[PDB]
Every structure is written in C-alpha cells, then in structure tokens.
Design an enzyme around this catalytic site. Structure first.
Site, PDB file in Angstrom:
ATOM      1  N   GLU A 192      -0.793  -4.606   3.356  1.00  0.00           N
ATOM      2  CA  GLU A 192      -0.917  -3.579   4.386  1.00  0.00           C
ATOM      3  C   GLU A 192      -0.980  -4.210   5.747  1.00  0.00           C
ATOM      4  O   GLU A 192      -1.339  -5.391   5.879  1.00  0.00           O
ATOM      5  CB  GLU A 192      -2.151  -2.672   4.156  1.00  0.00           C
ATOM      6  CG  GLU A 192      -3.485  -3.403   4.202  1.00  0.00           C
ATOM      7  CD  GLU A 192      -4.681  -2.553   3.848  1.00  0.00           C
ATOM      8  OE1 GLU A 192      -5.701  -2.650   4.569  1.00  0.00           O
ATOM      9  OE2 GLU A 192      -4.610  -1.815   2.838  1.00  0.00           O
TER      10      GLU A 192
ATOM     11  N   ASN B 229      -2.031   5.024   2.636  1.00  0.00           N
ATOM     12  CA  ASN B 229      -2.401   5.625   1.360  1.00  0.00           C
ATOM     13  C   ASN B 229      -3.742   6.394   1.472  1.00  0.00           C
ATOM     14  O   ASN B 229      -4.767   5.826   1.901  1.00  0.00           O
ATOM     15  CB  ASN B 229      -2.474   4.532   0.269  1.00  0.00           C
ATOM     16  CG  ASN B 229      -2.609   5.008  -1.157  1.00  0.00           C
ATOM     17  OD1 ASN B 229      -2.861   6.185  -1.447  1.00  0.00           O
ATOM     18  ND2 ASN B 229      -2.484   4.077  -2.092  1.00  0.00           N
TER      19      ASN B 229
ATOM     20  N   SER C   4       0.849  -1.187   0.000  1.00  0.00           N
ATOM     21  CA  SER C   4       0.000   0.000   0.000  1.00  0.00           C
ATOM     22  C   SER C   4       0.925   1.293   0.000  1.00  0.00           C
ATOM     23  O   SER C   4       1.837   1.439   0.841  1.00  0.00           O
ATOM     24  CB  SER C   4      -0.949  -0.055   1.191  1.00  0.00           C
ATOM     25  OG  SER C   4      -1.787   1.078   1.332  1.00  0.00           O
ATOM     26  N   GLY C   5       0.751   2.114  -1.043  1.00  0.00           N
ATOM     27  CA  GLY C   5       1.480   3.357  -1.244  1.00  0.00           C
ATOM     28  C   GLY C   5       2.622   3.227  -2.219  1.00  0.00           C
ATOM     29  O   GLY C   5       3.390   4.172  -2.390  1.00  0.00           O
TER      30      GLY C   5
ATOM     31  N   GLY D 256      -2.856  -3.819  -2.279  1.00  0.00           N
ATOM     32  CA  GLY D 256      -1.502  -3.988  -1.784  1.00  0.00           C
ATOM     33  C   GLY D 256      -1.400  -4.290  -0.313  1.00  0.00           C
ATOM     34  O   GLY D 256      -2.179  -3.793   0.517  1.00  0.00           O
TER      35      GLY D 256
ATOM     36  N   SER E  57      -6.331   4.616  -1.087  1.00  0.00           N
ATOM     37  CA  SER E  57      -6.182   3.173  -0.975  1.00  0.00           C
ATOM     38  C   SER E  57      -7.250   2.433  -1.716  1.00  0.00           C
ATOM     39  O   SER E  57      -8.405   2.854  -1.683  1.00  0.00           O
ATOM     40  CB  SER E  57      -6.227   2.763   0.489  1.00  0.00           C
ATOM     41  OG  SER E  57      -5.308   1.721   0.748  1.00  0.00           O
ATOM     42  N   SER E  58      -6.884   1.305  -2.355  1.00  0.00           N
ATOM     43  CA  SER E  58      -7.835   0.471  -3.091  1.00  0.00           C
ATOM     44  C   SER E  58      -8.365  -0.588  -2.183  1.00  0.00           C
ATOM     45  O   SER E  58      -7.637  -1.503  -1.793  1.00  0.00           O
ATOM     46  CB  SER E  58      -7.222  -0.118  -4.356  1.00  0.00           C
ATOM     47  OG  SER E  58      -7.071   0.857  -5.376  1.00  0.00           O
TER      48      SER E  58
ATOM     49  N   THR F   6      -1.733   1.490  -8.370  1.00  0.00           N
ATOM     50  CA  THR F   6      -2.966   1.995  -8.964  1.00  0.00           C
ATOM     51  C   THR F   6      -2.673   2.997 -10.054  1.00  0.00           C
ATOM     52  O   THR F   6      -3.301   2.919 -11.122  1.00  0.00           O
ATOM     53  CB  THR F   6      -3.936   2.489  -7.892  1.00  0.00           C
ATOM     54  OG1 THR F   6      -4.335   1.358  -7.102  1.00  0.00           O
ATOM     55  CG2 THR F   6      -5.161   3.187  -8.477  1.00  0.00           C
TER      56      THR F   6
HETATM   57  N1  LIG Z   1       3.929   7.429 -10.790  1.00  0.00           N
HETATM   58  C1  LIG Z   1       3.332   8.285  -9.958  1.00  0.00           C
HETATM   59  N2  LIG Z   1       3.354   9.605 -10.257  1.00  0.00           N
HETATM   60  C2  LIG Z   1       2.836  10.474  -9.383  1.00  0.00           C
HETATM   61  N3  LIG Z   1       2.284  10.232  -8.189  1.00  0.00           N
HETATM   62  C3  LIG Z   1       2.276   8.916  -7.919  1.00  0.00           C
HETATM   63  C4  LIG Z   1       2.744   7.901  -8.736  1.00  0.00           C
HETATM   64  N4  LIG Z   1       2.526   6.662  -8.153  1.00  0.00           N
HETATM   65  C5  LIG Z   1       1.957   6.952  -7.009  1.00  0.00           C
HETATM   66  N5  LIG Z   1       1.794   8.294  -6.793  1.00  0.00           N
HETATM   67  C6  LIG Z   1       1.268   8.934  -5.590  1.00  0.00           C
HETATM   68  O1  LIG Z   1       1.067   7.937  -4.604  1.00  0.00           O
HETATM   69  C7  LIG Z   1      -0.333   7.861  -4.265  1.00  0.00           C
HETATM   70  C8  LIG Z   1      -0.710   6.432  -3.983  1.00  0.00           C
HETATM   71  O2  LIG Z   1      -0.246   5.580  -5.041  1.00  0.00           O
HETATM   72  P1  LIG Z   1      -1.140   4.388  -5.557  1.00  0.00           P
HETATM   73  O3  LIG Z   1      -1.098   4.298  -7.035  1.00  0.00           O
HETATM   74  O4  LIG Z   1      -2.573   4.536  -5.029  1.00  0.00           O
HETATM   75  O5  LIG Z   1      -0.523   3.085  -4.886  1.00  0.00           O
HETATM   76  P2  LIG Z   1      -1.099   1.663  -4.458  1.00  0.00           P
HETATM   77  O6  LIG Z   1      -2.398   1.349  -5.114  1.00  0.00           O
HETATM   78  O7  LIG Z   1       0.069   0.728  -4.821  1.00  0.00           O
HETATM   79  O8  LIG Z   1      -1.208   1.694  -2.942  1.00  0.00           O
HETATM   80  C9  LIG Z   1      -1.066   8.560  -5.406  1.00  0.00           C
HETATM   81  O9  LIG Z   1      -2.323   9.096  -4.998  1.00  0.00           O
HETATM   82  C10 LIG Z   1      -0.073   9.653  -5.792  1.00  0.00           C
HETATM   83  O10 LIG Z   1      -0.169  10.818  -4.974  1.00  0.00           O
HETATM   84 MG   LIG Z   2      -4.274   0.864  -5.192  1.00  0.00          MG
END
Ligand SMILES: Nc1ncnc2c1ncn2[C@@H]1O[C@H](COP(=O)(O)OP(=O)(O)O)[C@@H](O)[C@H]1O
Ligand SMILES: [Mg+2]
Length: 758
Positions: free
Chosen positions: A446, A196, A149-150, A444, A199-200, A154
C-alpha cells in the site's frame, strides 16, 4: 492479420500493421479505418485468431505474451470468471461482488480429489493440489496469496481455509473453529483504509495441522506487526479497528451504559478519522440514534457489499460463542477497548506555577474515572503515571504527557490483540501433528499521499515474499531443468534482492542504522535520513523525494524523506517519526501501572529501554521464510481491477502493471517451455516393480516408462526425460497424477493396460 498494440487506458488494443518504419510499426486500430497510430516493434505482439474464446490455462494460448495474457483474463472476468491458471499458478481478479454459487458446499465437493485442469480454475483446486501433495509427498505445504491492498488476498485465504476444513476436517467442532477465527481476528486487526474498507493491519500465517491419517488435529495462527499508529489517530477518509465501530453501533443499552460509550465523535481515538458506520437501509434502522455521529447524520452510512458494523457485531459475538468464549471472556475484551477509548479522551494543561510540568484538564475527570474502572487501576495512580515519568520522579510537559497517554493505549491494545490471537489458538490446540497446510495472508502493498514507517515495513514484507517467489518459481525451477539437462530456454528477470539488501544489511542496512539513531543521546529523523543517503549515494531502489514523478512529493526536503522503488512500484516515504515508530519498548512507569492492576484479565495480558520494531520484524519474517522454504509452495496471485472498488470495471493498463510487477509475465515466458510436473523415473519404476512380468522387468526403466505413457495415450511432445527425473508439460497434470497414483489396485491395473498394449 490483427495484432495487439499499446493503449493508454486499456493497456493494449486491436488493429493491424499498415506500415513498417526503422524505429517503429504503423498500426491502424480495428473497427475504424483511416485513422492511424505508431508503436515500437517490441511493443507489438501477436493476438489469438478467436477474440471471443477464453482458455482456462494461459499456457494453452497460441501466442504466449503479456497482451494475450491480459486479454484472456479480461474476457474471463467479463463472463464473471475471476480465476485463471498459468500452469499451476492461479491468478485471481477481484470481482468486488458476490458471484453466485462459486464458493458453495456443492462447489467445495465438486473440487475434492480432482486433478489440476479436470475442473475450472479455482482457489479450491490450489487448496486440493496442496492437500494431495501433502498426503502423497509426506511434506507440509504452503499457500502464498499475493497482491496489493484490495486485491483479494484476505477473501482467498478464507476461501482456502473453508475448503480445507469442510473437506478434510473430521466433521466435529475443530473444523468450524479455524473458520470462526478470521472474523474474530478481523474485528481487532482490520480497518477501513482508502484502498480497502476491510484492510488487514497485520500479516498472518494460518496453519491447519494433520495426523498421518491426513485428518485435521487443530491449527495455529502467526501474526505480524499490527499497525499501532491507527489506534490513536486516522485520516478523515479512514478508520480505527472495526471493534470500536461494531461495539458503538451494536452494543446492548446495558453494555453502552456499563462501558460509558456514545457516538464515535466523542472519542479522541476515532473522531479524527471517519465516524460513519458501514450500514444499508435495513441495518441503519437497527442502530440507535445515541450512537450516530453528526457526520453520519449529515452524509449517511458507508457502503460495502460485505461490511456492516451492526450485522458484524452480532456475527463476531456469534463467532466468540462458537469458539468457546463465555460471556465473561467477551466483556473483558470490551472493557479493555472501552478503557483504551476513555484513556484517549484524557487531556492535559500546562502547570507552570504548581508542579512544573502539567496537570489534567477539569473536563478530563470523567474520562480518568471511566478509564480506571475498566483497566482496574486507581485514578490517582493513573494520574501520576501519565503526568510524571520517574527517571527520582520527573514531571512531563503537555506534549510529553500526550505521547505517554498514546504509548500506553497502543501497548494495551496490541496486548489485547496478542491475547485474542492466543485465545484463538487455544480453541484448536494439539499435542502433536505430522504435516500442515499453511496459508500466508500478509498485509498487502500500500501507499497513500503521505507514507511513513508503517508502509516501509508492510512493503519491506511484500518485498520478502516476492523474493521467495523469484527463488522457488524462477531461480530453482530453471536450475532443476538445467541440472537434469532439458535445455529449456533461460529466462532472466528483474530480481528484488538488491531492495532487501538495502533494508536488512547487518550493521549498515536502513534497519540497523535506524537502531543506531535510537541508541544515540539526542536521536533525529533528519540525522537518520542523512546516514541512509550517505551510505553511499548509489543504489537503484532509492532516490531523494524531489526525484518523484508525483508533484505532491517533490516538496519534501532531502533529509525529510526517501523514495523506495519497489518491485510493485515506487513509494516516496516521509521519514518523520521513524525513530519513535521504531521503539517497541514502553516506559517502566506505565508498564508497572498496568502490570500492578487489581484486575486479573489486565495482569494476564502483561506476561535506556529500547526494543527495535524493525529488527523484531526482520527476525519474525526470517523465521517465516525458513518455515516457508521447508514446505512445498503453491501461489495465488490476486489482482485489483480498479481503484473505485467497483465490479465489471476492468482497468486494462492498471492490471497489466500488476501482471508485470508480480513477475507473471516472466513465469508465462518460462512455462511456454517448462515442465511443472516431474518424478524420478527410477522411484516410479520401483513403485510398479512389484507387479510387472519378466518381459516388462528386462526393459530399462526409461523404456517401461515410455511404454506406460504410450498406453495412456500420452505424446512424445508431452513428456521429456532428464538425467534422473521424467518431466511433464502444462495441461497434463491429470495424466501425471494417475501415472503417480501409489494405490496398489491402480498400479497393478495399469500393468495390465501396458501388457495388452503389446
Ligand atoms: N473473491 C471475492 N469475492 C467477493 N468479493 C471479494 C473477493 N475478493 C475480494 N472481494 C472484495 O474486496 C474486498 C477486499 O478484499 P480483501 O480480501 O480484503 O483484499 P486484501 O486483503 O488483498 O487487501 C472484500 O471486502 C470484498 O468486498
Ligand atoms: Mg487483507
């Protein structure tokens, strides 16, 4: 010469060996002389001579070790280069900010049809290689985005989907519809957590379907286990689903009036967690005061680079409009959300000397009246349904009726999310397809200070997709090099199968034991945890809570929980509510109430009573893995740089752990001697056979192949002949691709290149 020795916060540090001991090696840190520290011979690794230089593929490093991998990624990240390869596997480090131009339509174009390595590392390159492979091998492809997570799974899932639709997607309506699906799914399935802000709370597999002409014909989204607990309660530093917050912050005065909304603090299902909105200076101005909670007025808006509850309300409504949702479809969704909120407010009081069980409080009448109009129910029908559970009708106490009111809200919400996913799939359907490209965005890995069934499932999922990784990349690749007779050095690894055998063993695994508990006359979370530990003490991925490193968890009794030492780190689980959280079934009183509703939209949602959540999920994931094992798999490895959600803050030691747990340190050892590109030398010869002269025909396939490579300036070190196939070293993807180009004008042009070579 300077080497890499361990550092507690940086992971590793530069210095040189000043002395050798029996157990260890005395190291003097670079920059400052005199001061020394000791590290073990195995903990010491060679460094690159040029510390300032960076490489695009880690396989290009002089010394291929965990310390050089960490340093390359570190340098790249400082220069705002978050993507790096380990041959065809991409590592993505979260920037936590918008790097200008790197996801633009100009960039999308620059990546189109380019071979791996003929452009810088990028998710687009992974997406294009997966498209090339689909078109060429006539085999459906899978993109697996991993990380905690983070990490950025996504965002990267979305980046790939934007690349594919913009690149190979007709130019018509359907192209953007796959893109506008995510903000709609995120409105209902994504929420602010401590790890996050977006978060998904569900896993997803988005497939982009193509015809034989390799042009998009539509898509299909699969969803996995939307977190039901979050619908009713949250922790003060976390929130419910974004929809509740976008609606309260951005609804027109008419919608607010119609749905009977107000500041999040007035609603039970929100006021336990954060009642603050995502806003800036500008957007905070656009939200009316009649929506701002006391917490918001005392502490201010929540900050996020991407999230904005007001700006996201308009952006989701605009996504609904762009995918064909009329104003009626829109409101129906809103009425259910609002109905779920007012339903939450309904409070009960002990009856004792009237009915026996309980009644509704005197100030719960507004909530009931509002809840009934939105869910198309009769107030009394609802009043009966929540206070009396027929089993010949039986009354319910206060606690039992609270459980009833939450259970119905959870089912109603989940059914709206299943409806949204469905309505989304309906905006891009198709009669048939030939091949597909599917992106896997799980929820992810967590963990928090308190971890229940939700985390056990999310992490059990993360375990499964990591098992697919070990299979595809390490078990099968080494098996191939072996079967062909290349004699590549064998790499042993920390397998995550034992952890999975522990959970899904038919009749005796955690899941089927939990089921057995639900099926008992008087179930118990204590009795459950006992049978788990009693079958049969020994297992490496299980320990009693007092055996935890963290102090917090050492106060948990043996029957009150268990620790699962996952691939991604150990997580102590508090087994309370496991039995309840494992029952997907809803009492028939509440099921019938909502089915027999004077409202078509609510009726349409709904198309010993026990349904195992765990085994429904086992079944769901096992279908996905079958789907995954049939396709060609591509991997994106997302890395979380820190725990403060900040940019330009590289936690060395934290990233190193992630590089170790994902098994990328193992892959790096195997790619040092592996051949990622390969083709059958006979099928390759047969492809050129139609255009080669008698002189070239008389030669054995291996000799024509050897001559064709020796024409395209390849080297003896670059390729290697197996028993059936020819193999190609990393950084030679560009070359391999042209060698393999099935276009007859290229094939015949290459025969001429070979003819002049002699
Ligand atoms: N490649 C990226 N470019 C810009 N910001 C990003 C990027 N990847 C992640 N982030 C930042 O991190 C936050 C969370 O990432 P996310 O894609 O939701 O991760 P996950 O689903 O793996 O937990 C996003 O809302 C954004 O602020
Ligand atoms: Mg996600």
């Amino acid at each position: 010469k300077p080497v890499w020795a361990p550092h507690p916060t940086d992971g590793f540090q530069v210095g040189n060996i000043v002395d050798i001991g029996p157990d260890s090696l005395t190291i003097e840190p670079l920059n400052q002389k005199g001061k020394t520290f000791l590290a073990l011979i195995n903990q010491v690794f060679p460094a690159e001579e040029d510390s300032k230089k960076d490489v695009e593929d880690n396989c290009s490093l002089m010394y291929l070790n965990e310390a050089t991998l960490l340093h390359n990624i570190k340098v790249r990240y400082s220069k705002d280069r978050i993507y790096t390869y380990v041959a065809n596997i991409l590592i993505a480090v979260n920037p936590y900010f918008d790097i200008p131009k790197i996801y633009s339509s100009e960039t999308i174009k620059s990546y189109q049809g380019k071979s791996l390595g003929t452009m810088p590392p990028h998710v687009f390159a992974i997406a294009d290689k997966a498209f090339r492979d689909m078109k060429v091998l006539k085999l459906s492809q899978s993109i697996i985005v991993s990380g905690e997570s983070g990490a950025g799974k996504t965002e990267n899932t979305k980046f790939v989907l934007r690349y594919l639709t913009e690149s190979y997607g007709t130019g018509q309506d359907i192209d953007d519809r796959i893109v506008e699906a995510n903000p709609l799914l995120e409105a209902f399935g994504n929420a602010k957590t401590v790890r996050n802000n977006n978060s998904s709370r569900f896993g997803k597999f988005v497939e982009i379907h193509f015809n034989e002409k390799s042009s998009v014909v539509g898509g299909f989204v699969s969803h996995y286990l939307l977190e039901k607990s979050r619908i009713c309660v949250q922790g003060k530093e976390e929130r419910n689903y974004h929809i509740f917050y976008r609606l309260c912050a951005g609804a027109s005065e008419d919608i607010r009036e119609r749905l009977h909304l107000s500041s999040p603090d007035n609603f039970r299902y929100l006021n336990r967690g954060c009642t603050r909105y995502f806003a800036n200076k500008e957007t905070d101005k656009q939200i009316l005061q009649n929506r701002k909670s006391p917490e918001y007025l005392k502490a201010g808006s929540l900050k996020d680079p991407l999230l904005d509850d007001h700006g996201d309300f308009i952006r989701m409504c605009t996504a609904m409009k762009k995918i064909g949702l009329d104003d009626e479809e829109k409101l129906d969704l809103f009425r259910v959300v609002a109905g779920v909120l007012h339903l939450g407010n309904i409070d009960f009081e002990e009856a004792g000397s009237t009915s026996g069980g309980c009644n509704l409080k005197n100030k719960s009448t507004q909530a009931l009246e509002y809840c009934a109009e939105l869910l198309g129910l009769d107030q009394d029908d609802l009043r009966v349904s929540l206070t009396t559970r027929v089993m010949i009708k039986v009354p319910l106490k206060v606690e039992q009726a609270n459980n009833a009111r939450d259970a119905l809200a959870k089912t109603v919400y989940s059914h709206l999310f299943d409806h949204v996913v469905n309505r989304v799939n309906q905006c891009f359907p198709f009669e048939t397809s030939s091949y597909f490209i599917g992106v896997l965005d799980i929820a992810g890995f967590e963990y928090f200070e308190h971890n229940s069934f939700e985390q056990f499932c999310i992490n059990y999922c993360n375990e499964k997709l990591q098992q697919f990784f070990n299979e595809r990349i390490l078990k099968e690749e080494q098996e191939l090099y072996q079967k062909e007779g290349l004699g590549v050095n064998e790499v042993h690894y920390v397998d995550n199968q034992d952890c999975i055998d522990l959970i899904e063993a038919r009749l005796v695994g955690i899941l089927d034991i939990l089921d057995e508990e639900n099926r008992l006359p008087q179930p118990s979370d204590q009795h459950f945890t006992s049978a788990v530990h009693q079958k049969h003490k020994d297992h490496f991925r299980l320990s009693i809570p007092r055996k935890s490193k963290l102090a917090i968890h050492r106060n948990i009794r043996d029957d009150e929980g268990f620790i699962i030492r996952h691939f991604a780190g150990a997580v102590c689980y508090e087994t309370t509510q496991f039995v309840e959280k494992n029952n997907d079934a809803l009492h028939m009183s509440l099921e019938s109430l909502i089915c027999e509703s004077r409202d078509k939209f609510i009726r349409e949602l709904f198309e010993l009573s026990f349904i195992s959540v765990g085994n429904k999920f086992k079944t769901q994931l096992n279908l996905l893995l079958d789907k995954l094992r049939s396709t060609g798999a591509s991997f994106i490895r997302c890395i979380k740089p820190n725990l403060k959600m900040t940019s330009h803050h590289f936690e060395g030691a934290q990233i190193l752990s992630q590089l170790q747990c994902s098994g990328m340190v193992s892959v790096l050892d195997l790619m040092q001697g592996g051949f990622p590109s390969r083709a059958s030398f006979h099928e390759l010869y047969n492809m050129y056979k139609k255009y080669m002269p008698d002189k070239l025909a008389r030669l054995d396939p291996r000799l024509f192949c050897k001559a064709l490579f020796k024409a395209l300036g390849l080297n003896e070190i670059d390729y290697k002949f197996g028993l059936t196939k020819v193999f190609f070293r990393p950084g030679k993807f560009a070359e391999f691709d042209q060698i393999m180009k099935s276009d007859p004008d290229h094939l015949a042009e290459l025969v001429k290149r070979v003819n002049h070579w002699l």
